[PDB]
């Protein structure tokens, strides 16, 4: 019953997977918009009159 309550696959007898992989995040997409804004802000602060 307790195994049922939790998210356990309930494999072979006394054999349940916990999915410790955590999906193993490997995908990467090069977030650019943020990087472009960051760089333009460097340039802004660099050239404004302070």
């Amino acid at each position: 019953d307790y195994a049922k309550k939790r998210g356990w696959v309930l494999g072979p007898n006394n054999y349940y997977s916990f999915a410790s992989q955590q999906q193993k995040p490997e995908d990467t997409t090069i977030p650019s918009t943020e990087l472009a804004k960051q760089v333009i802000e460097y340039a802004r602060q660099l050239e404004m009159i302070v």
């Binding site: 410790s20 977030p31 990087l35 960051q38 460097y42 602060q45 660099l46 302070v50």
Partner: protein
């Protein structure tokens, strides 16, 4: 805790008021269970205190830092203990660490008992007690750092424990806490440490350098703002 969590520290104070706020927040966390943030805030404070004066303040932060790190399974560096301004003010903690490394409950009890009233006076006793039942943690972190995979029976032999189930459980709880990075696998009966990942290839370096660059530009804007040309005063 409620008060601090609700009010906001103004970002323009002295060095000294920042040091005091940081010490109190560090102490309040260490009294609760968030050890790592307490360690971080404390080191920030110690790095923000006046250089020459505040011998008592440095003493306070250093003793609390020692206790918290010990509570974290790391080993604080021996450089400080021989500094003149904190040499004789930490001998209790010197013996304490000598005990925590080569864990000997006999020696831990001897040092706690003898230098007991002093610990209580400092305002830490509770934490050093929290240590006394965590003396194993140092050993398990050492075993992980040293070995990339070890059989559980070997751990039991190395930690002077009872049947290897106790060590099994302690290791599992540890990895749960986050002090160690590994994966247990009993069907062969060995705990396996996780490989080393390449930090540079990720985007961490970009983020860190961006933060630091922002700080530097802000320093410059402030610095050129502070100028006053009063020759027409």
């Amino acid at each position: 805790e409620k008060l601090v969590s609700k009010s906001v520290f103004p970002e323009q104070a002295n060095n000294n008021e920042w040091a005091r706020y940081l010490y109190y927040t560090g102490r309040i966390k260490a009294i609760q269970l968030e050890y790592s943030e307490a360690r971080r805030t404390m080191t920030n404070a110690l790095r923000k205190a006046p250089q020459h004066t505040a011998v008592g303040f440095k003493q306070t932060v250093h003793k609390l830092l020692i206790v918290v790190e010990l509570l974290l399974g790391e080993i604080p560096d021996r450089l400080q203990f021989r500094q003149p301004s904190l040499k004789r003010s930490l001998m209790p903690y010197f013996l304490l660490t000598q005990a925590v490394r080569t864990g000997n409950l006999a020696k831990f009890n001897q040092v706690l008992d003898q230098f007991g009233e002093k610990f209580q006076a400092d305002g830490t006793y509770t934490l050093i007690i929290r240590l006394r039942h965590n003396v194993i943690k140092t050993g398990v972190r050492m075993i992980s750092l040293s070995y990339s995979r070890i059989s559980l029976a070997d751990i039991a032999q190395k930690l002077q424990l009872d049947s290897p189930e106790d060590a099994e459980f302690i290791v599992a709880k540890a990895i749960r806490d986050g002090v160690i990075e590994a994966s247990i696998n009993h069907e062969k009966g060995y705990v396996q440490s996780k490989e080393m990942i390449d930090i540079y290839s990720t985007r961490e370096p970009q983020l860190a350098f961006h933060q630091r660059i922002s700080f530097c530009l802000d320093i410059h804007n402030m610095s050129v703002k502070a100028m006053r040309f009063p020759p027409k005063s």
